[PDB]
Short mmCIF file of C-alpha atoms and ligand atoms in Angstrom, two decimals:
data_model
loop_
_atom_site.label_atom_id
_atom_site.label_comp_id
_atom_site.label_asym_id
_atom_site.label_seq_id
_atom_site.Cartn_x
_atom_site.Cartn_y
_atom_site.Cartn_z
CA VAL X 2 -56.80 -28.12 -21.27
CA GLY X 3 -54.17 -29.68 -23.56
CA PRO X 4 -51.90 -30.45 -25.21
CA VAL X 5 -53.44 -33.95 -24.84
CA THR X 6 -57.17 -34.00 -24.10
CA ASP X 7 -60.64 -35.21 -25.07
CA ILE X 8 -62.98 -32.45 -26.25
CA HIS X 9 -66.68 -33.36 -26.16
CA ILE X 10 -68.92 -31.57 -28.64
CA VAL X 11 -72.39 -31.28 -27.09
CA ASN X 12 -75.74 -29.59 -27.42
CA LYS X 13 -76.81 -27.35 -24.55
CA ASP X 14 -79.39 -24.57 -24.16
CA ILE X 15 -77.52 -21.45 -22.98
CA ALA X 16 -78.40 -17.82 -22.30
CA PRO X 17 -75.18 -15.71 -22.33
CA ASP X 18 -77.18 -12.45 -22.64
CA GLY X 19 -80.37 -13.79 -20.99
CA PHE X 20 -82.00 -15.19 -24.16
CA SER X 21 -82.07 -18.98 -24.06
CA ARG X 22 -81.30 -20.91 -27.24
CA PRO X 23 -79.89 -24.27 -28.34
CA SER X 24 -76.17 -24.32 -29.13
CA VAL X 25 -73.27 -26.48 -30.29
CA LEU X 26 -70.46 -26.27 -27.69
CA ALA X 27 -66.99 -27.62 -27.10
CA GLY X 28 -66.83 -28.76 -23.48
CA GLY X 29 -70.39 -27.55 -22.83
CA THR X 30 -69.36 -23.88 -22.51
CA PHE X 31 -69.39 -20.72 -24.63
CA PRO X 32 -66.69 -20.04 -25.59
CA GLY X 33 -65.22 -23.52 -25.44
CA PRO X 34 -62.39 -24.42 -23.11
CA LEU X 35 -59.08 -22.60 -23.55
CA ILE X 36 -56.67 -25.07 -25.18
CA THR X 37 -53.00 -24.57 -24.25
CA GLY X 38 -49.56 -26.02 -24.79
CA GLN X 39 -45.93 -25.08 -25.28
CA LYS X 40 -43.96 -24.47 -28.47
CA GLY X 41 -42.77 -27.85 -29.75
CA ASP X 42 -45.69 -29.83 -28.27
CA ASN X 43 -47.56 -32.67 -29.95
CA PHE X 44 -51.25 -31.81 -29.68
CA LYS X 45 -53.49 -34.87 -29.45
CA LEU X 46 -57.00 -33.44 -29.42
CA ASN X 47 -59.59 -36.21 -29.37
CA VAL X 48 -62.83 -34.67 -30.61
CA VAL X 49 -65.86 -36.65 -29.42
CA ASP X 50 -69.06 -35.82 -31.31
CA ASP X 51 -72.06 -36.16 -28.94
CA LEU X 52 -74.44 -33.91 -30.92
CA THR X 53 -78.11 -34.84 -31.20
CA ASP X 54 -79.81 -31.71 -32.62
CA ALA X 55 -80.17 -31.89 -36.41
CA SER X 56 -81.12 -28.18 -36.57
CA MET X 57 -77.45 -27.23 -35.97
CA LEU X 58 -75.99 -30.39 -37.65
CA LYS X 59 -75.11 -33.58 -35.77
CA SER X 60 -71.79 -33.82 -37.64
CA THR X 61 -68.77 -31.59 -36.94
CA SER X 62 -65.14 -30.82 -37.85
CA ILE X 63 -62.71 -28.56 -36.05
CA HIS X 64 -60.13 -26.17 -37.49
CA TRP X 65 -57.14 -25.08 -35.41
CA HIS X 66 -56.83 -21.56 -36.74
CA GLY X 67 -53.35 -20.37 -37.63
CA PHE X 68 -51.38 -23.62 -37.40
CA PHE X 69 -49.38 -24.56 -40.48
CA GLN X 70 -50.21 -28.28 -40.18
CA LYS X 71 -47.07 -29.19 -42.20
CA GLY X 72 -47.36 -32.88 -42.98
CA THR X 73 -50.74 -33.08 -41.22
CA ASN X 74 -53.00 -31.48 -43.86
CA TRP X 75 -55.62 -34.13 -42.96
CA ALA X 76 -55.97 -32.50 -39.49
CA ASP X 77 -56.62 -28.94 -40.71
CA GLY X 78 -60.43 -29.18 -40.32
CA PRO X 79 -62.32 -27.75 -43.31
CA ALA X 80 -65.16 -30.07 -44.22
CA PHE X 81 -64.89 -31.45 -47.76
CA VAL X 82 -61.42 -29.89 -48.26
CA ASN X 83 -59.27 -31.62 -45.64
CA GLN X 84 -61.70 -34.23 -44.21
CA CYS X 85 -65.23 -35.57 -44.25
CA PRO X 86 -67.06 -34.48 -41.11
CA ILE X 87 -66.95 -36.44 -37.86
CA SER X 88 -70.30 -38.22 -37.41
CA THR X 89 -72.36 -38.21 -34.22
CA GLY X 90 -71.52 -41.03 -31.81
CA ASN X 91 -67.94 -41.12 -33.17
CA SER X 92 -64.60 -39.63 -32.21
CA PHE X 93 -61.66 -38.36 -34.27
CA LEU X 94 -58.10 -37.63 -33.11
CA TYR X 95 -56.43 -34.47 -34.35
CA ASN X 96 -52.75 -35.34 -33.89
CA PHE X 97 -50.36 -32.58 -34.91
CA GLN X 98 -47.20 -30.78 -33.93
CA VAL X 99 -46.37 -27.12 -33.50
CA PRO X 100 -42.53 -27.07 -33.72
CA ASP X 101 -42.04 -23.50 -34.99
CA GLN X 102 -45.07 -21.51 -33.81
CA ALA X 103 -46.04 -19.84 -30.56
CA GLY X 104 -48.67 -17.18 -29.90
CA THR X 105 -52.39 -16.65 -29.76
CA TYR X 106 -54.68 -18.84 -31.88
CA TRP X 107 -58.20 -20.21 -31.74
CA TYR X 108 -60.34 -23.12 -32.85
CA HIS X 109 -63.78 -23.43 -34.34
CA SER X 110 -66.12 -25.66 -36.28
CA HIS X 111 -65.31 -25.69 -39.98
CA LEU X 112 -68.51 -27.39 -41.13
CA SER X 113 -70.97 -25.01 -42.80
CA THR X 114 -71.99 -22.16 -40.43
CA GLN X 115 -71.81 -24.32 -37.30
CA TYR X 116 -69.21 -22.25 -35.44
CA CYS X 117 -71.75 -19.43 -35.25
CA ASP X 118 -73.98 -21.79 -33.22
CA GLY X 119 -71.26 -21.88 -30.55
CA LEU X 120 -68.30 -24.14 -31.39
CA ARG X 121 -65.42 -21.71 -30.93
CA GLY X 122 -62.70 -21.10 -28.34
CA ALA X 123 -59.18 -19.77 -27.79
CA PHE X 124 -55.90 -21.69 -28.21
CA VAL X 125 -52.63 -20.39 -26.74
CA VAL X 126 -49.16 -21.81 -27.37
CA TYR X 127 -46.71 -20.41 -24.83
CA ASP X 128 -43.02 -19.90 -25.61
CA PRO X 129 -40.72 -20.75 -22.66
CA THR X 130 -38.07 -18.37 -24.12
CA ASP X 131 -40.57 -15.78 -25.40
CA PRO X 132 -38.46 -12.75 -26.43
CA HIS X 133 -41.18 -10.41 -25.07
CA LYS X 134 -41.58 -12.13 -21.65
CA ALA X 135 -39.85 -9.38 -19.64
CA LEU X 136 -42.40 -6.82 -20.97
CA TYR X 137 -45.16 -8.18 -18.70
CA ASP X 138 -45.82 -9.84 -15.33
CA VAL X 139 -49.01 -11.83 -15.92
CA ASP X 140 -49.92 -14.04 -18.90
CA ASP X 141 -52.45 -16.78 -18.15
CA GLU X 142 -56.07 -17.87 -18.64
CA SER X 143 -57.21 -14.63 -16.95
CA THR X 144 -55.57 -12.42 -19.61
CA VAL X 145 -57.23 -14.09 -22.62
CA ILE X 146 -60.04 -11.87 -23.96
CA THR X 147 -62.38 -13.36 -26.57
CA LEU X 148 -64.66 -11.13 -28.62
CA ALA X 149 -67.72 -12.93 -30.02
CA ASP X 150 -70.86 -12.13 -31.96
CA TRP X 151 -73.95 -13.90 -30.68
CA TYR X 152 -77.21 -14.56 -32.56
CA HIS X 153 -80.64 -15.22 -31.09
CA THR X 154 -81.59 -17.13 -34.27
CA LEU X 155 -79.95 -20.48 -35.10
CA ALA X 156 -77.46 -20.18 -37.97
CA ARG X 157 -79.43 -22.49 -40.30
CA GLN X 158 -82.74 -20.68 -39.49
CA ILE X 159 -81.43 -17.15 -40.33
CA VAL X 160 -83.66 -15.30 -42.82
CA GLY X 161 -81.87 -12.80 -45.09
CA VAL X 162 -78.71 -11.01 -43.93
CA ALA X 163 -77.38 -12.25 -40.57
CA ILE X 164 -76.96 -9.44 -38.01
CA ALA X 165 -75.42 -10.21 -34.64
CA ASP X 166 -77.68 -9.56 -31.66
CA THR X 167 -75.12 -9.24 -28.88
CA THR X 168 -71.39 -8.77 -28.34
CA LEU X 169 -69.96 -11.27 -25.84
CA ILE X 170 -66.63 -10.63 -24.15
CA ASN X 171 -65.31 -13.81 -22.49
CA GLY X 172 -68.77 -15.24 -23.15
CA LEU X 173 -70.68 -12.48 -21.32
CA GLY X 174 -72.57 -9.43 -22.46
CA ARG X 175 -75.81 -7.48 -22.46
CA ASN X 176 -78.35 -7.24 -25.23
CA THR X 177 -79.95 -3.90 -26.05
CA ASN X 178 -83.44 -5.45 -25.42
CA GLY X 179 -82.34 -7.95 -22.77
CA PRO X 180 -82.00 -8.19 -18.98
CA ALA X 181 -79.63 -5.47 -17.68
CA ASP X 182 -78.77 -7.67 -14.72
CA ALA X 183 -77.05 -9.98 -17.29
CA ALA X 184 -73.48 -10.44 -16.06
CA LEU X 185 -70.58 -8.46 -17.47
CA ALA X 186 -67.14 -9.98 -17.90
CA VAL X 187 -64.52 -8.72 -15.47
CA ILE X 188 -60.79 -8.57 -16.22
CA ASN X 189 -58.99 -8.46 -12.85
CA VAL X 190 -55.73 -6.49 -12.46
CA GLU X 191 -53.53 -5.14 -9.64
CA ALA X 192 -52.05 -1.64 -9.69
CA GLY X 193 -48.45 -1.59 -10.94
CA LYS X 194 -48.52 -4.94 -12.79
CA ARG X 195 -48.35 -5.47 -16.54
CA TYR X 196 -50.63 -7.91 -18.38
CA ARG X 197 -50.27 -9.67 -21.72
CA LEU X 198 -53.84 -9.33 -22.98
CA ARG X 199 -54.38 -11.97 -25.64
CA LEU X 200 -57.18 -10.45 -27.70
CA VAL X 201 -58.92 -13.06 -29.85
CA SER X 202 -61.68 -12.39 -32.35
CA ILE X 203 -63.88 -15.48 -32.49
CA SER X 204 -66.39 -13.54 -34.61
CA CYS X 205 -68.56 -15.03 -37.35
CA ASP X 206 -68.95 -11.56 -38.91
CA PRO X 207 -68.42 -8.19 -37.24
CA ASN X 208 -65.14 -6.44 -36.62
CA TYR X 209 -64.68 -4.71 -33.23
CA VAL X 210 -62.97 -1.49 -32.19
CA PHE X 211 -61.43 -2.50 -28.87
CA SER X 212 -60.36 -0.01 -26.18
CA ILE X 213 -60.11 0.36 -22.41
CA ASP X 214 -60.98 3.72 -20.83
CA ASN X 215 -57.91 5.63 -19.58
CA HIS X 216 -55.51 2.88 -20.69
CA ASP X 217 -53.35 2.15 -23.71
CA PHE X 218 -51.43 -0.82 -25.08
CA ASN X 219 -48.23 -2.04 -26.67
CA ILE X 220 -48.98 -4.59 -29.40
CA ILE X 221 -46.33 -7.36 -29.28
CA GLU X 222 -47.94 -10.14 -31.37
CA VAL X 223 -50.09 -10.25 -34.50
CA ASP X 224 -51.90 -13.50 -35.49
CA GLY X 225 -49.10 -15.60 -33.85
CA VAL X 226 -46.20 -13.47 -35.19
CA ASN X 227 -44.04 -11.51 -32.74
CA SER X 228 -44.01 -7.80 -33.55
CA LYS X 229 -41.91 -4.84 -32.55
CA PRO X 230 -43.86 -3.24 -29.68
CA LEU X 231 -46.37 -0.74 -31.13
CA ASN X 232 -48.04 1.79 -28.83
CA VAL X 233 -51.78 2.15 -29.56
CA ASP X 234 -54.94 3.23 -27.71
CA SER X 235 -57.55 1.45 -29.84
CA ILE X 236 -57.46 -1.75 -31.88
CA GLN X 237 -59.83 -2.63 -34.73
CA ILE X 238 -59.91 -6.43 -34.85
CA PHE X 239 -61.45 -8.37 -37.76
CA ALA X 240 -62.97 -11.84 -37.71
CA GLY X 241 -60.37 -14.41 -36.63
CA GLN X 242 -57.50 -11.96 -35.98
CA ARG X 243 -55.48 -12.01 -32.76
CA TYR X 244 -53.27 -9.50 -30.98
CA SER X 245 -51.24 -9.59 -27.81
CA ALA X 246 -51.51 -6.14 -26.26
CA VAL X 247 -49.51 -5.38 -23.10
CA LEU X 248 -51.56 -3.36 -20.62
CA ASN X 249 -49.84 -1.55 -17.75
CA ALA X 250 -52.23 -1.22 -14.80
CA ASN X 251 -50.94 2.31 -14.19
CA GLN X 252 -54.18 4.19 -13.47
CA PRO X 253 -55.81 4.88 -10.11
CA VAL X 254 -57.46 1.89 -8.43
CA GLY X 255 -60.98 1.69 -9.86
CA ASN X 256 -63.30 0.23 -12.49
CA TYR X 257 -62.74 1.06 -16.16
CA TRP X 258 -64.94 0.21 -19.15
CA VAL X 259 -63.61 -2.32 -21.65
CA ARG X 260 -65.25 -1.47 -24.99
CA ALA X 261 -65.71 -3.63 -28.10
CA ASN X 262 -67.72 -1.67 -30.65
CA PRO X 263 -69.07 -3.76 -33.55
CA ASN X 264 -69.36 -2.43 -37.13
CA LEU X 265 -72.92 -3.82 -37.46
CA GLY X 266 -75.92 -4.57 -35.25
CA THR X 267 -76.46 -2.34 -32.22
CA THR X 268 -73.40 -0.12 -31.78
CA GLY X 269 -72.23 2.04 -28.91
CA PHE X 270 -72.49 1.39 -25.19
CA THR X 271 -75.94 2.43 -23.91
CA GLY X 272 -76.92 0.28 -20.89
CA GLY X 273 -73.51 -1.40 -20.85
CA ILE X 274 -73.87 -3.27 -24.16
CA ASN X 275 -70.68 -4.01 -26.10
CA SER X 276 -68.80 -3.73 -22.80
CA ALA X 277 -66.87 -5.48 -20.07
CA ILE X 278 -65.07 -4.24 -16.92
CA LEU X 279 -61.39 -3.77 -16.02
CA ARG X 280 -61.33 -3.95 -12.21
CA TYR X 281 -58.32 -3.11 -10.08
CA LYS X 282 -57.93 -5.07 -6.82
CA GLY X 283 -59.41 -2.85 -4.08
CA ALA X 284 -62.02 -1.15 -6.27
CA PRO X 285 -65.71 -1.46 -5.42
CA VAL X 286 -67.57 -4.30 -7.11
CA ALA X 287 -69.56 -1.99 -9.38
CA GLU X 288 -69.89 -0.84 -12.97
CA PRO X 289 -67.41 1.76 -14.25
CA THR X 290 -68.28 5.46 -14.55
CA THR X 291 -65.37 6.18 -16.89
CA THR X 292 -65.36 8.16 -20.13
CA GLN X 293 -64.21 7.05 -23.56
CA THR X 294 -61.44 9.52 -24.37
CA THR X 295 -60.64 10.16 -28.03
CA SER X 296 -58.27 7.64 -29.69
CA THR X 297 -55.03 9.55 -30.46
CA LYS X 298 -53.07 6.50 -31.65
CA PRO X 299 -55.31 3.87 -33.26
CA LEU X 300 -53.69 0.72 -34.62
CA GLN X 301 -52.90 0.98 -38.33
CA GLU X 302 -51.68 -2.25 -39.95
CA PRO X 303 -48.83 -0.59 -41.96
CA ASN X 304 -47.28 0.51 -38.64
CA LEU X 305 -46.85 -3.12 -37.49
CA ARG X 306 -43.37 -4.61 -37.98
CA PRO X 307 -42.13 -8.14 -37.33
CA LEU X 308 -39.86 -8.41 -34.27
CA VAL X 309 -37.32 -10.49 -36.23
CA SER X 310 -36.38 -9.81 -39.85
CA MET X 311 -38.80 -11.70 -42.09
CA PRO X 312 -37.70 -10.92 -45.65
CA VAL X 313 -40.46 -10.49 -48.23
CA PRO X 314 -40.35 -13.29 -50.83
CA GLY X 315 -39.63 -12.26 -54.42
CA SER X 316 -38.46 -8.88 -55.70
CA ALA X 317 -39.58 -5.39 -54.71
CA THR X 318 -42.06 -4.62 -57.48
CA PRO X 319 -45.66 -5.67 -58.24
CA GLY X 320 -45.72 -9.14 -59.78
CA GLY X 321 -42.11 -9.78 -58.71
CA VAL X 322 -42.71 -13.43 -57.81
CA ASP X 323 -42.86 -16.84 -59.50
CA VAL X 324 -46.71 -16.98 -59.47
CA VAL X 325 -49.22 -14.10 -59.50
CA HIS X 326 -52.97 -14.49 -58.94
CA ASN X 327 -54.91 -11.25 -59.09
CA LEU X 328 -58.12 -12.64 -57.61
CA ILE X 329 -61.40 -11.13 -58.77
CA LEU X 330 -63.73 -10.87 -55.78
CA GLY X 331 -67.37 -10.59 -56.79
CA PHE X 332 -71.01 -11.36 -56.16
CA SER X 333 -73.71 -12.49 -58.60
CA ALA X 334 -76.84 -14.66 -58.71
CA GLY X 335 -77.06 -14.63 -54.88
CA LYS X 336 -73.51 -15.94 -54.38
CA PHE X 337 -70.02 -14.65 -53.64
CA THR X 338 -67.45 -15.49 -56.29
CA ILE X 339 -63.67 -15.70 -56.71
CA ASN X 340 -62.60 -15.49 -60.37
CA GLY X 341 -66.28 -15.99 -61.32
CA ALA X 342 -66.75 -19.22 -59.29
CA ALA X 343 -68.80 -19.69 -56.11
CA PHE X 344 -67.42 -22.41 -53.83
CA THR X 345 -69.74 -25.31 -53.02
CA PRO X 346 -68.29 -28.35 -51.21
CA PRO X 347 -67.44 -31.50 -53.21
CA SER X 348 -68.72 -34.92 -52.06
CA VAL X 349 -65.15 -36.27 -51.91
CA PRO X 350 -62.85 -34.06 -49.83
CA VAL X 351 -60.20 -32.33 -51.95
CA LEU X 352 -57.38 -34.04 -49.99
CA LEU X 353 -58.93 -37.45 -50.55
CA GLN X 354 -59.32 -36.70 -54.30
CA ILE X 355 -55.57 -36.06 -54.49
CA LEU X 356 -54.52 -38.98 -52.26
CA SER X 357 -56.72 -41.38 -54.24
CA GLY X 358 -54.92 -40.44 -57.50
CA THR X 359 -56.47 -37.27 -58.98
CA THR X 360 -53.35 -35.19 -59.65
CA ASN X 361 -54.37 -33.35 -62.85
CA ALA X 362 -55.41 -29.76 -62.09
CA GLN X 363 -58.41 -29.87 -64.48
CA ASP X 364 -59.90 -32.95 -62.73
CA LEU X 365 -60.01 -31.61 -59.15
CA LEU X 366 -63.48 -30.77 -57.80
CA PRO X 367 -65.16 -28.40 -57.43
CA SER X 368 -64.40 -27.33 -60.98
CA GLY X 369 -63.48 -23.64 -61.12
CA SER X 370 -62.75 -23.42 -57.36
CA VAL X 371 -59.40 -25.24 -57.13
CA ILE X 372 -56.17 -23.45 -58.13
CA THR X 373 -53.01 -25.59 -58.14
CA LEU X 374 -49.79 -23.94 -56.90
CA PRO X 375 -46.36 -25.38 -57.66
CA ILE X 376 -44.19 -26.26 -54.67
CA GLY X 377 -41.12 -24.21 -53.69
CA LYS X 378 -42.23 -20.96 -55.35
CA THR X 379 -42.97 -17.37 -54.38
CA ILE X 380 -46.64 -16.41 -54.65
CA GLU X 381 -48.37 -13.02 -54.80
CA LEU X 382 -52.14 -12.67 -54.37
CA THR X 383 -54.12 -9.48 -54.77
CA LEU X 384 -57.58 -9.16 -53.26
CA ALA X 385 -58.94 -5.93 -54.72
CA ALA X 386 -62.01 -4.79 -52.80
CA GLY X 387 -65.30 -3.16 -53.83
CA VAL X 388 -67.58 -6.21 -53.69
CA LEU X 389 -70.59 -5.79 -51.39
CA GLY X 390 -70.91 -6.92 -47.76
CA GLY X 391 -67.42 -5.80 -46.71
CA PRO X 392 -65.00 -5.10 -45.27
CA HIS X 393 -64.07 -8.75 -45.94
CA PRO X 394 -61.33 -10.26 -43.75
CA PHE X 395 -59.56 -12.90 -45.86
CA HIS X 396 -57.85 -15.93 -44.37
CA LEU X 397 -55.30 -18.37 -45.84
CA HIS X 398 -54.90 -21.80 -44.29
CA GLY X 399 -51.52 -23.59 -43.97
CA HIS X 400 -49.52 -20.33 -44.06
CA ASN X 401 -48.73 -16.89 -42.79
CA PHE X 402 -48.33 -14.19 -45.41
CA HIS X 403 -46.56 -10.85 -45.77
CA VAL X 404 -49.02 -7.98 -46.10
CA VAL X 405 -47.09 -5.99 -48.69
CA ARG X 406 -50.10 -3.71 -49.22
CA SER X 407 -52.75 -3.15 -46.51
CA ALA X 408 -56.21 -1.65 -46.87
CA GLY X 409 -55.84 2.14 -47.12
CA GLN X 410 -52.18 1.87 -48.16
CA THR X 411 -51.20 2.94 -51.70
CA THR X 412 -47.47 2.21 -51.86
CA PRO X 413 -46.39 -1.40 -51.22
CA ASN X 414 -43.84 -2.22 -48.51
CA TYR X 415 -41.33 -4.87 -49.64
CA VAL X 416 -38.91 -4.27 -46.73
CA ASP X 417 -40.59 -5.05 -43.40
CA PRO X 418 -44.37 -5.51 -43.66
CA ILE X 419 -46.20 -7.47 -40.97
CA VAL X 420 -46.76 -11.20 -41.44
CA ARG X 421 -50.16 -12.57 -40.34
CA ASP X 422 -53.00 -14.94 -41.36
CA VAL X 423 -56.20 -12.82 -41.56
CA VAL X 424 -56.19 -9.53 -43.47
CA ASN X 425 -58.84 -6.86 -43.93
CA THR X 426 -59.36 -6.32 -47.68
CA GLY X 427 -61.05 -2.93 -47.07
CA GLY X 428 -63.27 -1.16 -49.62
CA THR X 429 -63.42 0.38 -53.07
CA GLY X 430 -59.96 1.59 -54.10
CA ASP X 431 -58.09 -0.88 -51.87
CA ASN X 432 -55.86 -3.53 -53.43
CA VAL X 433 -54.60 -5.66 -50.61
CA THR X 434 -51.55 -7.63 -51.70
CA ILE X 435 -50.06 -10.61 -49.87
CA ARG X 436 -47.04 -12.86 -50.50
CA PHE X 437 -45.91 -16.26 -49.30
CA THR X 438 -43.74 -19.21 -50.37
CA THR X 439 -45.13 -22.66 -51.15
CA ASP X 440 -43.40 -24.76 -48.47
CA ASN X 441 -46.38 -26.89 -47.42
CA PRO X 442 -47.83 -29.58 -49.72
CA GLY X 443 -51.61 -30.05 -49.54
CA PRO X 444 -54.94 -28.33 -50.28
CA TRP X 445 -55.43 -25.12 -48.29
CA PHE X 446 -58.54 -22.93 -48.10
CA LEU X 447 -58.51 -19.21 -48.87
CA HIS X 448 -61.76 -17.53 -47.88
CA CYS X 449 -63.52 -14.63 -46.29
CA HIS X 450 -63.72 -15.28 -42.54
CA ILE X 451 -67.24 -13.83 -42.37
CA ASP X 452 -68.78 -17.29 -42.03
CA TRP X 453 -72.03 -16.29 -43.77
CA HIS X 454 -69.97 -15.31 -46.82
CA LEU X 455 -67.97 -18.54 -46.87
CA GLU X 456 -71.32 -20.41 -46.84
CA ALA X 457 -72.47 -18.21 -49.76
CA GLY X 458 -69.40 -19.19 -51.86
CA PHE X 459 -66.57 -16.77 -50.98
CA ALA X 460 -63.71 -19.26 -51.08
CA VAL X 461 -61.15 -20.99 -53.27
CA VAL X 462 -58.89 -23.99 -52.56
CA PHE X 463 -55.18 -23.76 -53.30
CA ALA X 464 -53.92 -27.27 -54.08
CA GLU X 465 -50.30 -26.65 -53.14
CA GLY X 466 -47.75 -29.16 -54.44
CA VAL X 467 -50.31 -31.69 -55.68
CA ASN X 468 -47.65 -34.26 -56.63
CA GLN X 469 -45.90 -33.90 -53.23
CA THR X 470 -49.14 -34.11 -51.20
CA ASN X 471 -49.27 -37.91 -50.76
CA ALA X 472 -45.65 -38.24 -49.57
CA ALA X 473 -46.00 -35.19 -47.31
CA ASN X 474 -49.27 -36.13 -45.59
CA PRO X 475 -49.51 -39.76 -44.45
CA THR X 476 -53.00 -40.25 -43.01
CA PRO X 477 -54.17 -42.14 -39.91
CA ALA X 478 -56.73 -44.97 -40.01
CA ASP X 479 -59.44 -42.85 -38.34
CA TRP X 480 -59.14 -40.15 -41.05
CA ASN X 481 -59.23 -42.89 -43.71
CA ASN X 482 -62.66 -44.04 -42.47
CA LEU X 483 -64.39 -40.65 -41.99
CA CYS X 484 -66.04 -40.55 -45.43
CA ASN X 485 -67.28 -44.16 -45.16
CA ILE X 486 -68.97 -43.38 -41.83
CA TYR X 487 -70.37 -40.01 -42.93
CA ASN X 488 -71.74 -41.19 -46.29
CA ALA X 489 -73.61 -44.05 -44.52
CA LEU X 490 -75.63 -41.58 -42.41
CA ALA X 491 -79.32 -40.97 -43.03
CA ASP X 492 -79.90 -37.35 -44.15
CA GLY X 493 -81.60 -36.55 -40.81
CA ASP X 494 -78.47 -37.59 -38.88
CA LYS X 495 -75.96 -35.31 -40.72
C1 LIG B 1 -54.22 -4.69 -57.97
O1 LIG B 1 -52.81 -4.62 -58.16
C2 LIG B 1 -52.31 -5.45 -59.20
C3 LIG B 1 -50.80 -5.28 -59.25
O2 LIG B 1 -50.25 -5.90 -58.08
C4 LIG B 1 -52.96 -5.07 -60.53
O3 LIG B 1 -52.53 -6.03 -61.50
C5 LIG B 1 -52.28 -5.47 -62.81
O4 LIG B 1 -53.49 -5.32 -63.54
C6 LIG B 1 -53.33 -4.76 -64.84
C7 LIG B 1 -54.71 -4.45 -65.43
O5 LIG B 1 -55.51 -5.64 -65.42
C8 LIG B 1 -52.50 -5.74 -65.67
O6 LIG B 1 -52.30 -5.22 -66.99
C9 LIG B 1 -51.16 -5.98 -64.98
O7 LIG B 1 -50.44 -7.01 -65.66
C10 LIG B 1 -51.34 -6.41 -63.53
N1 LIG B 1 -50.05 -6.44 -62.85
C11 LIG B 1 -49.53 -7.54 -62.31
C12 LIG B 1 -48.19 -7.38 -61.65
O8 LIG B 1 -50.07 -8.63 -62.33
C13 LIG B 1 -54.48 -5.09 -60.40
O9 LIG B 1 -55.10 -4.62 -61.60
C14 LIG B 1 -54.90 -4.20 -59.24
N2 LIG B 1 -56.35 -4.23 -59.15
C15 LIG B 1 -57.11 -3.14 -59.05
C16 LIG B 1 -58.60 -3.35 -58.98
O10 LIG B 1 -56.64 -2.01 -59.01
C1 NAG B 2 -48.66 -34.09 -61.36
O1 NAG B 2 -47.86 -34.97 -62.17
C2 NAG B 2 -48.56 -35.57 -63.27
C3 NAG B 2 -47.64 -36.61 -63.90
O2 NAG B 2 -46.44 -35.96 -64.35
C4 NAG B 2 -49.01 -34.47 -64.24
O3 NAG B 2 -49.80 -35.06 -65.28
C5 NAG B 2 -49.82 -33.40 -63.49
O4 NAG B 2 -50.06 -32.26 -64.32
C6 NAG B 2 -49.12 -32.92 -62.22
N1 NAG B 2 -50.06 -32.08 -61.50
C7 NAG B 2 -49.81 -30.82 -61.12
C8 NAG B 2 -50.94 -30.13 -60.41
O5 NAG B 2 -48.74 -30.26 -61.32
CU1 CU B 3 -60.55 -19.47 -38.38
CU1 CU B 4 -57.48 -21.06 -40.52
CU1 CU B 5 -66.93 -11.49 -46.53
CU1 CU B 6 -61.10 -21.61 -43.05
#
């Protein structure tokens, strides 16, 4: 569907691994419908909130992950940063353009932990003059592969640490204690053809080590950014990351296991959990018998290079930028913290605070969780790891960033590091460093993409170009009324 479409947000009981539970779904499916368009399109995505189950929230808001939203900050999605939520029985039109981006993206609820309850799907923007197009034969709905964590317990009823119950690949998977006749996803190929696999993590938490028995890949895209082709045989993919990986169907006609091994919950592949099937045309309709061969060329982020020269902003030394924030990532008193502050949402969305006249840095709410950035400047952030519950994949809205230092990398790369929008911060001893330029007025979230951690405070808002935000982001009438509608709701109807 798309670029112009209604998207109904509904409650439905579903059982993707055989266990039935209530859910919040775009288009009544898990994952939601694939949204598509072409580079340069105007997306007009009319989100119709038909939710009735208070246990997963009747309100909603959708984030279109990876899009810059230049001049449409109001459409970015995060509840109480960029909008008040959409209220049940109402619609809201996300109306934005994608002039300068093409690649593999996704969308998800950005209200509390609601995307874990099912509101997530893939979003692909095709490039009619894609520089990589001659490297593959097939690129369509059938080559999108979503990796999802699935919980038997509703997000708002979770007790203690959330642990995914089942891995779902294209919405299908087996649970370790579930029916073994539960359907496995099948990726269909024909011998001799080449496939652009668009691998999308729609995870609320775990990372996945992705592989296909007896096959390898050339990575050609990273979080929307074209890369030099990189030959790999396994891909660790963190929450919200995307890769395009070209697969050549060059093995004998048969069935081959597709493997997505999570870092938490039940790991491995006993009984066909954490698995899907690559089936060549002409093979029996049956489960694979193939063996996981050792990974001789796993993806390492420092090996990724942009296809086109993307010069690193600033100078080639630590702190060689206009603005440095060495962010202190911590945990105390039951909450995650950035520079000592746990994010909790304000009653007035940050964008509305600014648009209504609050332009002094000290007055923006929540106090301690908003950092103003001046417009037209080079920025360096460090995200030194060690804090519990990792590895934490950090995400910056409104921007891509250069990963000048990856997890596990000591010496920064100021020449040709990859540019992306979700980065693994790693563990103790890592000091992930990212750079970008402030070219996009408005408030933009920076947070851990483990949704449980965002809920527990692991976020900060960058109010970029506060005094340019009003001129840059004219708002539509329906956005202007969201807070009035939402604040009028009874507490049981939120
Ligand atoms: C992560 O790297 C940054 C450099 O990019 C370190 O920042 C320096 O920290 C020291 C000690 O606090 C300061 O005296 C320097 O002024 C900082 N340099 C810059 C350029 O800002 C940071 O300490 C590193 N973090 C960890 C945990 O190793
Ligand atoms: C915006 O401009 C006003 C008026 O000059 C000033 O008081 C304020 O500090 C500016 N805000 C930021 C975040 O630069
Ligand atoms: Cu996201
Ligand atoms: Cu995002
Ligand atoms: Cu986290
Ligand atoms: Cu976000």
